[PDB]
Design a protein around this ligand. Sequence first.
Ligand SMILES: Nc1ccn([C@@H]2O[C@H](COP(=O)(O)CP(=O)(O)OP(=O)(O)O)[C@@H](O)[C@H]2O)c(=O)n1
Ligand SMILES: [Mg+2]
Ligand SMILES: [Mg+2]
Ligand SMILES: [Zn+2]
Lengths: 52, 94, 104, 1112, 53, 83, 263, 96, 14, 91
Amino acid sequence: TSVYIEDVLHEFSTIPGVKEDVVEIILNLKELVVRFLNPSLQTVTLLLKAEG
Amino acid sequence: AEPGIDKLFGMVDSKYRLTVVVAKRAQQLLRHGFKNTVLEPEERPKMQTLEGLFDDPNAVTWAMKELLTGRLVFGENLVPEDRLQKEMERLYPV
Amino acid sequence: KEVRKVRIALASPEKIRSWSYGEVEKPETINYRTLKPERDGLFDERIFGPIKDYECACGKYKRQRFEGKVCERCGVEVTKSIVRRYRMGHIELATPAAHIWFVK
Amino acid sequence: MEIKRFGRIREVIPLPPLTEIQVESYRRALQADVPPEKRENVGIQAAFRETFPIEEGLVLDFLEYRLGEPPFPQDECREKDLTYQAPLYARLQLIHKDTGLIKEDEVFLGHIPLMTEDGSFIINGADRVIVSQIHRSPGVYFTPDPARPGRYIASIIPLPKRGPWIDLEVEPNGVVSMKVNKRKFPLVLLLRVLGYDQETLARELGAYGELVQGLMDESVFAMRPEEALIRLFTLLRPGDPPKRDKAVAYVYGLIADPRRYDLGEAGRYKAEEKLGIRLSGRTLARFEDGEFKDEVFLPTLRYLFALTAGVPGHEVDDIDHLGNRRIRTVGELMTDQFRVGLARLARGVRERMLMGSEDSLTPAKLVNSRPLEAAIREFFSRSQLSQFKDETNPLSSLRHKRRISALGPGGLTRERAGFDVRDVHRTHYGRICPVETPEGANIGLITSLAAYARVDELGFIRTPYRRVVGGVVTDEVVYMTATEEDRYTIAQANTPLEGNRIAAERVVARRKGEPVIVSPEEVEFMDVSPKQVFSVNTNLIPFLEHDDANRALMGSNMQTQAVPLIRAQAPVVMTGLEERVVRDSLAALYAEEDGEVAKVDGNRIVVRYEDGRLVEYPLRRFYRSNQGTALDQRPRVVVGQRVRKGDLLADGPASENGFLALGQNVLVAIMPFDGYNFEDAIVISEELLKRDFYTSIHIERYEIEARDTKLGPERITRDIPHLSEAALRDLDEEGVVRIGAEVKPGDILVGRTSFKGESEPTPEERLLRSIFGEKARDVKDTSLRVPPGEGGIVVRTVRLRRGDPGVELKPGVREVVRVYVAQKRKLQVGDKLANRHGNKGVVAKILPVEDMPHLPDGTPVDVILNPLGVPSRMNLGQILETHLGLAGYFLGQRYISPIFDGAKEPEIKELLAQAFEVYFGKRKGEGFGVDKREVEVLRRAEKLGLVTPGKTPEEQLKELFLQGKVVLYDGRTGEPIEGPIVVGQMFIMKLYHMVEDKMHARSTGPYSLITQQPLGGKAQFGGQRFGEMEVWALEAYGAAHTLQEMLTLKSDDIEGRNAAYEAIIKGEDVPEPSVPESFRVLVKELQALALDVQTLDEKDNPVDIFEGLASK
Amino acid sequence: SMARPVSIGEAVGIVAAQSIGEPGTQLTMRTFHTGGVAGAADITQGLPRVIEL
Amino acid sequence: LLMGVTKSALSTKSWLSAASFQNTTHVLTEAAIAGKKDELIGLKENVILGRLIPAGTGSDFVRFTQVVDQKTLKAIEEARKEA
Amino acid sequence: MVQVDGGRFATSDLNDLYRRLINRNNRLKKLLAQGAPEIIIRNEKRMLQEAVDALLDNGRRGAPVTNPGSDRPLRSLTDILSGKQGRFRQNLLGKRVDYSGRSVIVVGPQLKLHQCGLPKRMALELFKPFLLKKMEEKGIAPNVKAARRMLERQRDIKDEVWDALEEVIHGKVVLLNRAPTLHRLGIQAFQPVLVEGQSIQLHPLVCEAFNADFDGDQMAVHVPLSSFAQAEARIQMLSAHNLLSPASGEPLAKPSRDIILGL
Amino acid sequence: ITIGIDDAFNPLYVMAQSGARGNPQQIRQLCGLRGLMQKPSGETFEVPVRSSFREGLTVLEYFISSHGARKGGADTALRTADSGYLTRKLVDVTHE
Amino acid sequence: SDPVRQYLHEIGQV
Amino acid sequence: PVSLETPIGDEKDSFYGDFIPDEHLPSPVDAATQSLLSEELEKALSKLSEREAMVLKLRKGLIDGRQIENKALRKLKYHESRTRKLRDFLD
DNA sequence: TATAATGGGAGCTGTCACGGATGCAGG
DNA sequence: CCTGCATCCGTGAGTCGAG
Ligand SMILES: Nc1ccn([C@@H]2O[C@H](COP(=O)(O)CP(=O)(O)OP(=O)(O)O)[C@@H](O)[C@H]2O)c(=O)n1
Ligand SMILES: [Mg+2]
Ligand SMILES: [Mg+2]
Ligand SMILES: [Zn+2]
């Protein structure tokens, strides 16, 4: 339901060192299937940090 | 279609006369705050809101519904305008 | 009175003058620095009317308490500015001129 | 996926550069890369050669000229609102006749706008395109006299504004008459001035019976050419004193001087070819040895008399024949205005030569470039042929550069344009597209260039053909004009071929356009491709041979209106032209030489070629086009990838892997659905929105300025009187909205305050002032706010200030702020979709995936089209495209089906048969048999005769699948549709017309100055026009009060409208309307015409509608 | 429109002019659909006769 | 005398109607010389002045119609019966 | 003579014509007072006559007066009065009106013959002065100006005001009109049904009468203000009220396309 | 109801008969043949178009069709103003 | 016809 | 200056002056603004004693168009902090 | 305020059909 | 000079929208 990226103000930006634009990245993130093992758990923030 | 419109067209010799009558009656109802209505409390047009049934704000719907009942008299030269104004100002002041 | 008729007819020079609130003399519009109507110009307030409601060109009378009063300073009548859409001016020709409509 | 392609016709030559009609022309006109001494007589060089030398004493002559480098690059021009241009310097020399002193100098004439790589211009920051203009090629033509059956009219036509038209006629009385500037005179007189004698005319023209006798006037031959010259001068110029040199000057300027009268090189060539003579110059007559020597007139009169006599070898000229019509390209159109400004400059030179010190003068003090600069600037700014560039998608620009107009200066005016002009000529074949053209008033006036078509140096459109020698088709390619074309018997391109030999005994061919069946020995030439017959756009329509021309037109024109999509896909069925369009549009980025990719980034791509040099290609990212569509390039390569010459690096807007992607490939079913597709309406799936199909990015530019006022300066600031922090929240310290902030209608993009006028506060305002306690503020809130129905995320901001380095605004302007705001638009109800076959419609419903009709295996369709659109429009292409699409869905492959050499029925039958195995056999292998529902559908189909009775259900399902029809289940019921439905992949585009832009409504708003009626347009927040016909509608209904409201309260009745609004907000009934202001305007305007218009009562007494305001 | 005597005060002239003009304009801008056809093309040759009268 | 729609429309008695159709200069000169009065008979004339068209609900036939309830009718009848 | 947005000035051509006339009249007077010869006064009087000509009707006699470095003939009083762009046809016999709007049309199948889908966003602006009073009658706003200032920012708009709008339009009708309007049925009265989205929903049966299809045609909406105009609209102009063509007397609202197909 | 290329109770026949859409001539062009065409002058081509939209048209036949196609197109975009003029005149004479 | 030509004619009289 | 009749578009259709609003004449909402302002000011002045009414309205010029002064000032400061609904008129 | 200077310059060209007036050759 | 036909001149040439 949401995406935050460091040094990115809006969806129409582009990230230096990255092939895809922000829009395409979000489009890929929409295809992500996340499974909650806990019935009571309503929300989770996943963290990603990568480079090189 | 407007409810019982065929009957309303039947009442008048010209449709434009029906329009004039409905309009004038609506104006009368607006001016006197629906105090002069010929309708019974249960015959009153209603509007459905979030709360419940209230009085229908539309004066034209009122006028046509009244006109359907036959409790109104319409025609030409029924009464001088000023006397009508004053009498209705007496019976239903604003 | 309700208008029941519309009549159209030729206008006598005397009538045309009886319409006018003054003769337009100079072929000027507005001052380049002040952007105000030039005196005796096509836009002059002393003829057609005040630019702003109930105020003269000089500014002596700024309120509605004066209506019909002509300021002796700037010669402007204090009234509603809407009269600038109504009041006619006029130009007095040195030589008469044929209205082309009745010619060509 | 695999691309399987069809067709038996081998195209010998590729498509010529598609933008060359612009590029080659303008390059030809400028000649910047040609050394000044090797420059030819065409273009601005020509203009310089005609204008100079300037005489009267002193003689100023033209030595040379040069073009410098652009002071700014294209992008910087685009941002700073400048023009992409090069400085034009001219080396000229002042020469004194008496003294002999020669002063040589180089003067700066101003700048000439430069054409970009793609063929457009940048004028004042905006991309523009100069549209090529077709017109009648100058020359000598002969047309039958409409009134007189047995007589003809000769016409001598120069270039536009190059001097007068001349008409030669044979009068009833027998004399030959000449018309110049609407004045008829006997040709004998002018011929006498030219030096012709009765002897000469008798021996030359005598062969025709009695014709020459009308040219015989004994009184004319009785006087020498001088008396004839003065006589002619008094004829053409009454009241003018008949001095000899005055007559010489007039007749010379009219008929002789090349600086005034100028035929085109096309006019010269056509005159030579037609009349059968050799012209020395481009003029009708010459002044040589102090006398007048004829060039044109005598051969023309000769041809006229020969034609009238009935002499064989003489024909009338079809003036719509493309041999008689030529195209003026960008170079010529610019060159003419350059010439005008140059002649004006010359007038200035002479005018300054006569005055001033005759001793101290230099070419710098003589030459004023202002008229030239003004001429060129006026051309590139205010000309009709100069059009705001349509960049919506690459194909838009590509097509726009290939446009041909009969409108504009020098051409036709509307309602000067007959049916003849707008018709499709037989000579349009291979040259101008028979299909693509606007619907409505401009039909036939605006057209498009054929794909293989070329425009030569003379301006005539040429098309390639292949030489055929003795039944053998060579590879020799000849580009011919229409005239040349008329000489040969030209076979069709689809004629049977075994190798290079004609395989058919009977061959279809064309002789002067007339269709005829001939023998192979008679074939002189052959069509290169069917593709040459139609434009680029028309060539992008698969199965065009199955579509009606009327709909093919719309399909062709709507691709220009297709919006770039973030998910955009190349069509399943292409024509094979899809790559060349992207390439020649220069939207995509390509690899120059062989090499390896060094770097791949979102913003840039670095490549190391075989040369070893490091080349960095920056990528255009989220740039707003003229039409508001986002144009950005995306990288198609990965780090270390080996690339060849011309291989794809980045994909441009509306591009997929170097192929033109104008839209999406969707799974459609053709069937009525609950009246939601009723009358061209379109039903779409919500899953289209889920996966972001038909989703497009749009960026809007908002602008605001702060200038100096006599009341004190406006300024952009965060301090805005009487506003909450909630309102100022997204504003930065400077008062401009921050990047990345969301904006909705009513939000402030740029804060600005302006000093109020001299203001007399009403006592109530003063009361409010004292009451709140805060002192009155000097300024007021003028801030730029988001317009109704608009908004988005702010992507960019630009701020130009006075006193900043490199920044200079227009006089008086302190600062200028631009705000670029972007939004992502999905497909919504009210948006317009169209296919390439001319089927267009608005999305009327978006259904959830469960309501949608679905295949037996559970696959729901994306779009439901209505079959009722098909039979009337007679475009069957969209049907076939669907069939071939269906196979393409299951076989998982795209197709290329060239126009008129296509995939035919049996091939699509085979492909469908192959796809059916993947569609069914999979189910049979999954352990599933035929469904009961499918059995019922097959029963109904048996009764429909769509399947052969007695066969197994599988065989029948196959028989249906070969017809492109399948069993479809209703999403709501689960029960199958009572018959088989056509389903398959279709290519559909979202056009530029989106309900988000078009929706508008107004209660009250801005009013017009004089009329005091609401303004027009959504941009002005105006009202809808209630015209004569709408008033007629209300009148016919007999609704009087409604109409009166339209005419008074709702428009110009000021008292009425103010009192109406006030009465409505108080909850009372609307007041009686009073006299509309426009009638008052009418009365006063009638008075200024010295006519008294009086409103009267029944007693004939004056009634004052001005309420004593206009009466003293 | 109402299948009954005309109501007094109805504007007859406007209705007439509209009723006569409407088919002319509508039929004019409808699509031609060539082939199997020759001659004067129906509506287009009819109209100038009407205007003639 | 039979004349076509155009000439018949320019020959009408209303100068405001004629001048709003064609040949405005001609019509206006003729009228101004004649001192023509427009009685505002037709639709166009009243439309120009923003008046109520003399048709439909603007017809003199139906526009004077009055509507009154029985109470008021009998009341005015008592006021009449009194004096 | 009015200053535009940019700070520059815009002015009518009548001002330039009047300028010519005044200048030439002044020069004529001065030439008279200074005892000029015959030919001069003659030419001057001619010029004056041509200036009056230019003012009253331009281009009527001789070549039309134009501005310097311009081929555009100046606009005289005659040009103002007559013509297609003339005061009569443009500003009198027809007008641009308040309380109006337009948008793209889409077909609701589900509407009754007397109804049309009206986007909320449009009806908000169309019915605005009524909605203000309604918001004053309820607790949504302190007073009228507060209510109007409330709707200026889209984010300042809550849910209850929408229900207020629902109460406002109740029983009332609007006018749908599609250009060109060939006959009187190019405008019909519809009781509006507030719809989400930006498109006007149009009933299928009125299409043929409007000559309207779904390929991107747009329609204009109007709001009759008075109890009288509402009476006329509802009784006379209602779609369900006119079922037959005033031309042939045959039904103008009839099954077509898909309907005929199914039946 | 649906439209396949193989149609040429048939959908075309149904729609044409019922009055849903289409007329016999258009159906004929979809199925049997296009027919004779018109040179821009008003003359007639000796060779009739033997193709139908189902069969598909040769480039030549298509170009032959384009003539009459545009002749028709120009008519509708020209003659229309002639009609509206008539209508306006009628209104002007009958308005009172 | 043409005012300028007329003036130039009246000028050529003296 | 530039002409109002300066042609907009390729055709004869519209003029540049048709896009310029009239900034002089008050739109209906402005007349309604003055009306509602005078009304709200009149109705919320209920605090006023008669002497302070005539004298403070002469202070603010609400009559002829042009110690108790201080008490009226203070009372007006008192009623400003009261209803908090007059902010709208203050722009 | 002083050599003498003495008749302009661009033109816009491919519609079509009408009513009314004006003019010229013919009965 | 009175009638009739040829010729010139002025007047028109769909709606709304967008620019
Ligand atoms: N200049 C114009 C162009 C169009 N219109 C109107 O728009 C409609 C569709 O025309 P259209 O050309 O978009 C389709 P159509 O002619 O009906 O062919 P089709 O049925 O095979 O699709 C016409 O019926 C006119 O009422 C107009 O008033 N003025
Ligand atoms: Mg449509
Ligand atoms: Mg249609
Ligand atoms: Zn004063």
